[PDB]
């Protein structure tokens, strides 16, 4: 579906229509480092915050999944991916949910676009 890139440039996150978030460590494998299948509908967008170690996935089920991903330059330190929040209460119109998600360049603010014409600013 969509892709996002870590600011360090060594990590890629792939959103899929198969309800999967794919974390790739470019120095680890051409295979996905982790696969996550929490969404109930097709996942639309994945975005990494440019500064803070948080990334989010927006899907058509209306739920926005917020993950904390910590990345260290060390070879031993594999990236630490943990669930942090599951933002809900977003409408679905014509079986279309969270279409696009964007991160504030400075602080942990998430802009979510729904199918009903509403923009949610999760603080």
């Amino acid at each position: 579906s969509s892709l996002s890139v870590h600011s360090s440039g060594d990590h890629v996150i792939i959103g899929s229509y198969d309800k999967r978030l794919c974390w790739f460590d470019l120095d680890f494998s051409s295979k996905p480092y982790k696969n996550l299948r929490y969404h109930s509908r097709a996942l639309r967008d994945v975005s990494y915050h440019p500064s803070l170690p948080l990334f989010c996935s927006g899907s058509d089920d209306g739920d926005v999944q917020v993950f904390h991903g910590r990345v260290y330059s060390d070879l031993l330190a594999n990236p630490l991916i943990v669930p942090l929040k599951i933002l809900r209460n977003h409408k679905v119109v014509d079986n279309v949910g969270v279409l696009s998600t964007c991160w504030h360049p400075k602080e942990a603010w998430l802009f979510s676009a729904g199918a009903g014409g509403e923009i949610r600013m999760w603080t």
Binding site: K34, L36, Y38, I81, P83
Partner: peptide, 24 residues
């Protein structure tokens, strides 16, 4: 704490043993 304890199912497939939590 309970919500994060119940929702921590990282990529594990067969290691996911929530069958016990669903019956017992």
């Amino acid at each position: 704490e309970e919500k994060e304890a119940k929702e921590l199912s990282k990529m594990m497939m067969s290691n996911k043993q929530r069958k016990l939590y669903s019956k017992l």
